[PDB]
Write a protein that binds this ligand. Structure first.
Ligand SMILES: O=c1[nH]cnc2c(-n3cc(CCN4CCC(c5ccc(Cl)cc5)CC4)cn3)nccc12
Ligand SMILES: [Zn+2]
Ligand SMILES: [Zn+2]
Length: 337
């Protein structure tokens, strides 16, 4: 509780030596209380690059671009997807940068954030989302989203590319199975993020359930449909604590177990993402409320038998009454504490 009491989004600048061990660095940022915010930024060493150039990806296929139709008013919105036929990065970039879809003129991020929440429902953009693949070169061993080699490998552990344009969005959600996530912004215009501290996650859900009663009756985890957009002003009006951060090209974002996040793309960009885990996630995975209507489901037995043997028979019987302390860092953070 003494580390990051404010539960603000923290930014880290590892050296090349510190950067070489992924899992150890996550253990480090947790010892500093980075997890309390639910979101952290890692700016890698200047010399590190996962690929020499991105000039050879014009004919990369985006199998399922999605047109994002948003409906709503007064800070509350629902986003509907319209799957379009496959398109190439070249075709996507032409559309992203055209007069119809390009980023508007602005001076400060605050002005662009205002234009986003003002025009979210107009001129629906296209998101080249969830493309199976990696933009990492084969020889890259540091922070390779393709091969993190965390405890999740015991199994959602494959990489996805997201090609964004101005105003494309990701709705409020937590990772599948309340897992961790890593997001690398390969190139292009920034990506803005909002996060709710895991310790206040239940407050967001209670607010979401109050505003979408129909959705709440149909599903016990309706936010996992990733359709719900709620503005910072609406979170402020209902006392939901949150923080905001802008991710720029060449920066990593780490999301933590039960860390609610949302956000939007400033313009044409490309991000790579995957889920991962630490010993700390096991309890989150066991207690995750899943979409019952409807999805991604990991069997927790293999994790419990290996990392909680003393509790394995107790848990299988439905007697593991363990209550999660969101402020506690991962056990692997011991060497830093
Ligand atoms: O920028 C983002 N775009 C799009 N999605 C984002 C995102 N997430 C998307 C998923 C779903 C993944 N499965 C595969 C479908 C989970 N999180 N989390 C953060 C940022 C983004
Ligand atoms: Zn996410
Ligand atoms: Zn559902």
């Amino acid at each position: 509780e003494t580390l990051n009491p404010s539960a603000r989004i923290m930014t880290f600048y590892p050296t090349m030596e510190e950067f070489r061990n992924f899992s150890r660095y996550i253990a480090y940022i947790e010892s500093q209380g980075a997890h309390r915010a639910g979101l952290a930024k890692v700016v890698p060493p200047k010399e590190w690059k996962p690929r020499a150039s991105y000039d050879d990806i014009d004919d990369l296929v985006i199998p399922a671009p999605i047109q994002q139709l948003v409906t709503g008013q007064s800070g509350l919105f629902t986003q509907y997807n319209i799957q379009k036929k496959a398109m190439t990065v070249r075709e996507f970039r032409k559309i992203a940068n055209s007069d119809k879809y390009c980023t508007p003129r602005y001076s400060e991020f605050e002005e662009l954030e205002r234009k986003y929440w003002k025009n979210l429902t107009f001129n629906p953009p296209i998101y080249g989302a969830d493309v199976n693949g990696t933009l990492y070169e084969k020889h890259v061993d540091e922070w390779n989203i393709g091969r993190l080699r965390t405890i999740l490998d015991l199994v959602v552990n494959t990489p996805y590319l997201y090609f964004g344009m101005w105003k494309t969005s990701f709705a409020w959600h937590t990772e599948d199975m309340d897992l961790y996530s890593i997001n690398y912004l390969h190139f292009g215009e920034p990506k803005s993020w909002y996060s709710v501290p895991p310790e206040h996650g239940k407050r967001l859900e209670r607010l979401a359930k109050g505003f979408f009663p129909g959705s709440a009756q149909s599903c016990e985890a309706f936010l996992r449909h990733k359709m719900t957009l709620i503005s910072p002003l609406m979170l402020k009006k209902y006392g939901i604590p949150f923080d905001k951060v802008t991710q720029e090209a060449g920066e990593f974002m780490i999301t933590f177990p039960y860390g609610y996040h949302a956000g939007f793309n400033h313009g044409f960009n490309c991000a790579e993402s995957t889920n991962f885990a630490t010993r700390r996630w096991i309890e989150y995975g066991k207690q995750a409320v899943l979409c019952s209507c409807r999805m991604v489901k990991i069997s927790m037995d293999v994790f419990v038998r290996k990392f909680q043997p003393e509790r394995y028979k107790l848990w299988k019987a439905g007697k593991d009454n363990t209550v999660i302390d969101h402020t506690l860092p991962t056990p692997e953070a011991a060497e830093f504490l």
